[PDB]
Amino acid sequence: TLRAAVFDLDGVLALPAVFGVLGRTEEALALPRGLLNDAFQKGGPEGATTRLMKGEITLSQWIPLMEENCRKCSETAKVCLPKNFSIKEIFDKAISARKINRPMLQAALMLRKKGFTTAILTNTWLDDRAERDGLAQLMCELKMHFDFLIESCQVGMVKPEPQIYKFLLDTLKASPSEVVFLDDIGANLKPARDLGMVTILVQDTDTALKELEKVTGIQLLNTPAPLPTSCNPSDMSHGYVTVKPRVRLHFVELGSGPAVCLCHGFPESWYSWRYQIPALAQAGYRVLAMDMKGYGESSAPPEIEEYCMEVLCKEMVTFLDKLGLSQAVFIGHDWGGMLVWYMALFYPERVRAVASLNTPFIPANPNMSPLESIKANPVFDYQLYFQEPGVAEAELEQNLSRTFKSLFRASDESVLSMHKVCEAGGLFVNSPEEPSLSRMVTEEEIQFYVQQFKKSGFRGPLNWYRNMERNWKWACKSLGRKILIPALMVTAEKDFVLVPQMSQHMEDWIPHLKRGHIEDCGHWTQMDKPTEVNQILIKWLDSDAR
Amino acid sequence: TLRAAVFDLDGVLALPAVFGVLGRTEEALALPRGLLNDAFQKGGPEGATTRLMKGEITLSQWIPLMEENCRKCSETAKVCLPKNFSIKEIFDKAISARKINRPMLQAALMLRKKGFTTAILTNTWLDDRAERDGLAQLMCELKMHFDFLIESCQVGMVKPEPQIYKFLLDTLKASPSEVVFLDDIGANLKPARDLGMVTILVQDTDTALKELEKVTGIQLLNTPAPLPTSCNPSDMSHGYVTVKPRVRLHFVELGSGPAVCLCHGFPESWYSWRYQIPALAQAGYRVLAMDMKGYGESSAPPEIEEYCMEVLCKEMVTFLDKLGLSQAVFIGHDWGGMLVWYMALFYPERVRAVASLNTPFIPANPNMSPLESIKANPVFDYQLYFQEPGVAEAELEQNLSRTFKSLFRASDESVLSMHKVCEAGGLFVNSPEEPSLSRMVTEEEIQFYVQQFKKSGFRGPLNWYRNMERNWKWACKSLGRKILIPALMVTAEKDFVLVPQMSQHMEDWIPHLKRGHIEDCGHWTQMDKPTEVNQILIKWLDSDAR
Numbered sequence A, B: 001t002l003r004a005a006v007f008d009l010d011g012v013l014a015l016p017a018v019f020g021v022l023g024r025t026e027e028a029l030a031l032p033r034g035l036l037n038d039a040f041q042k043g044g045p046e047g048a049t050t051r052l053m054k055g056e057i058t059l060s061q062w063i064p065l066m067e068e069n070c071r072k073c074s075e076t077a078k079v080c081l082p083k084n085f086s087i088k089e090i091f092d093k094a095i096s097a098r099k100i101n102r103p104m105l106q107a108a109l110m111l112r113k114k115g116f117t118t119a120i121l122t123n124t125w126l127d128d129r130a131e132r133d134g135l136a137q138l139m140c141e142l143k144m145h146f147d148f149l150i151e152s153c154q155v156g157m158v159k160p161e162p163q164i165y166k167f168l169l170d171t172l173k174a175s176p177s178e179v180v181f182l183d184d185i186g187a188n189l190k191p192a193r194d195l196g197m198v199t200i201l202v203q204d205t206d207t208a209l210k211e212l213e214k215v216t217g218i219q220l221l222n223t224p225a226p227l228p229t230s231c232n233p234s235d236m237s238h239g240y241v242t243v244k245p246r247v248r249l250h251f252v253e254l255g256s257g258p259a260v261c262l263c264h265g266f267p268e269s270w271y272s273w274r275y276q277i278p279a280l281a282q283a284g285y286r287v288l289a290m291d292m293k294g295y296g297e298s299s300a301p302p303e304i305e306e307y308c309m310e311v312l313c314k315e316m317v318t319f320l321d322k323l324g325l326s327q328a329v330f331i332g333h334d335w336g337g338m339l340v341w342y343m344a345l346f347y348p349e350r351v352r353a354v355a356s357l358n359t360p361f362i363p364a365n366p367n368m369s370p371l372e373s374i375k376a377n378p379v380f381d382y383q384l385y386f387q388e389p390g391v392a393e394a395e396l397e398q399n400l401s402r403t404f405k406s407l408f409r410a411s412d413e414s415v416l417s418m419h420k421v422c423e424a425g426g427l428f429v430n431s432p433e434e435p436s437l438s439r440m441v442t443e444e445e446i447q448f449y450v451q452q453f454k455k456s457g458f459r460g461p462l463n464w465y466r467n468m469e470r471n472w473k474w475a476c477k478s479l480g481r482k483i484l485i486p487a488l489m490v491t492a493e494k495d496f497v498l499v500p501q502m503s504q505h506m507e508d509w510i511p512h513l514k515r516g517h518i519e520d521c522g523h524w525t526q527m528d529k530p531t532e533v534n535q536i537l538i539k540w541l542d543s544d545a546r
């Protein structure tokens, strides 16, 4: 039975193929058909291109050899190469035009998700051109989704040499009949077929995937839309900054470009942004996904006042100072959403742009105590339940698996009634001991949250709700201000507490505010509608944040 | 006796002052003298500018108020403001022209080095302009050198209000006669003088520093050139990436911009780059200063083969992959310098540019065993001493303080003779039990190295020298290649092992190679000549790396 799938890069995982561009170049320059492909392969195993593919020479060293082969071929064909003929320009364009064949990558991803060991086996070169970063980015984006990447120029062997196929089998630790091998070059399929591997000649992707689906018995075509790439905690770069003697902030970091600081809500983790992290980094941003103070690997001091907005914001500024960042885009959700609005109001110089998911910006009312304000809306009753130190900690810490499975549910998955939490004696008094698992999470994702919360529990997280008076006094200082830096408010149709209507008067305070709105989306925006969150965030970042 | 020094920002730590630019603007526009400064201060404590300085409103909210005050003042003076008059353009230019007053900052730095608590006390605003990042960068660069930053718009008080001076004294935890206060605004000096603080009216920097030097009894003028800013380990962002199950790599991270990966030598630390980290980040780079494999907080597996160049380079590639970096500039010193040349030869797509301090690029000789090659040059005898597992570990681990004090010495500080190490029975057989401290390091810096080496000792570090045959075979694969990506070789005049002459034939392999050369510089380049290293590296990064 098949357990491994091997894909070629050029003409399989990336389109168009180099041969295709050489063919299009020949036509545009009115050169004899096959002239450039002949010069490219000239000398066969003894030729310049085999030396390049085996890593003997670099791409810049190969360019004049390809030039001479083109002159030699033109001379024999009794044709003239044009006056401006340039192998460097021809190849720069061919490499630059290449894009990931998204349906092929999705099929590779589906097979790995079903237990297949996947690999990329490619005839490639040591690219030392000034423009090499283009290819470097393409390889990075592709390679992360595979168990192995075998490159001809790193192993000193090329397809169709029998040895590279033996090297592949040794790397896979699989026998030939357990492997399916996809290639757009027929001659490169022959040695894999000779060993007894299942082989697919890729012309059009749809037919290649049809053959792959039939042979594996795994559906690869006509599948439901896949979710964005997630994060494996053990594969991330974990960063740690001490903001003050007893406070260290943990974050996960991915990508290059402008700094984008992700701020989770209650009771969450940097892991709540798992579907956003890879997508934002791929979009050209340096993502900093925080464990907010009181959570995960960040410090969790016991004192209530350590969690007031003024203290938390000052620490986020120190966090930037210590990392040597003049600014970051701040994106927040729930309590994180509140923090980012305050970051925009008090430290606009340090905030490149601000975005909130679900949490509206509501000015403090100087004529009413925040306790009275919270009492006015029945959906906020849970916030009063959270006031008494120890009460909510006991209930939430009792059974962590039950806590997360009861909380992390989509809007149509029998969500907890937020009505009369105090009167009922707790959040889970009408909830089962063993809740069903939401479609939004796997059992392993729930256990990740359970492990994170075993470190510090719910004291620090709950203290975020215990500074109403202190936060109100500090917010009153900002009442004459407006938020005039780039801002985005994203409402979720089915968030029954942070209702879209609560955001209705935001333009009075944030006149240039941009909006996003997600239909059929509950409170847990990032994991409920990850693809939609990603599209909204990336479109806004690219237009308003740089 | 004085123990604290307080500096104003505008006209003291940053030049020119806003008042100065308003004055120059008045002249250029042929407006009445003082018209703009009058409009700026209009209404005094009740005015628009006091509201702005107290954080009541942001800079963008204030701009139309300043416009109206300019119209009101022009009307009363019976003059016309020009057709294109723009407060936004006037202020953007004034803020943008402001640069750090380097002699004032150096004096502040010298005072803090002598035990003074230092602070910045400023009448400032909440800057929400599109161009705010300029000011954000200036504040970041300045604030890091001080114990405190007190900003009017964050405390809701302004100079010359008596309360802000009481707030200052409370923050300093100092009595008025213990404080020296520098300001370019006479009216803002009066309340500090009234409390009993020493006050200096800053006009020209030289005279202000003369008064400051006389009053503190600390030399601030005509001082020897200061060293670049260093790093406090506890103030850095510490990053951790698992490259494989048993291997994690630790790094320190600072700044934004293109990724610059710093690779130390033997027997060093990320801390060997302390004088480069702040300077490169200030120069607009994202610095990644590694603890190389076998060192500090990075993993130190016992196996020799874990430290061959092929394995180390593959791990550095995985390190980039996991951080989501397509490239980094690689800068190496000693063993790090060797690694970066191999990174350039084997993975040019991932290397933006390559630089080495002291370590030349020498191709492998396929006609001679590396053991024979090492035996040919007497200065490399210590490398043969390093071969036998356990021997050098015992000697180097015996007394860590003695190891580092004997090794870390400038070329004119009785450096160890590298001649006949094997025959002598060790590196320290002719060295004292208690070596004197080199002028390059403090006792506390030596103890930092002692603490780092107590974790894993010298096995992992020494294994870097125990892969001669394996590295030679792998390097032989690259013999047909040339390094064609941007490259810099920095030679040190007085490095008695890695002599400048050893780099003489590098152009045969790296034709476009750029060079740097440091006179009176020994092996420990980064700490021996930090200012010179910085100038060479920054000039090269800005011209050749982007």
Ligand SMILES: O=C1Nc2ccc(C3CCCCC3)cc2C12CCOCC2
Residues within 6 Å of the ligand: A266, A267, A382, A407, A408, A409, A415, A416, A417, A418, A427, A494, A495, A496, A497, A498, A522, A523, A524
């Ligand atoms: O729609 C919502 N908004 C929303 C907002 C907040 C919360 C809190 C309540 C206290 C514990 C942490 C989560 C829950 C929800 C729901 C309603 C209840 O089911 C989960 C989602």
Ligand SMILES: O=C1Nc2ccc(C3CCCCC3)cc2C12CCOCC2
Residues within 6 Å of the ligand: B266, B267, B382, B407, B408, B409, B415, B416, B417, B418, B427, B494, B495, B496, B497, B498, B522, B523, B524
């Ligand atoms: O000039 C040099 N180059 C240079 C190069 C390497 C080393 C090694 C030798 C083995 C232990 C680690 C350092 C020492 C030096 C010196 C000569 C000896 O004094 C220190 C500097």
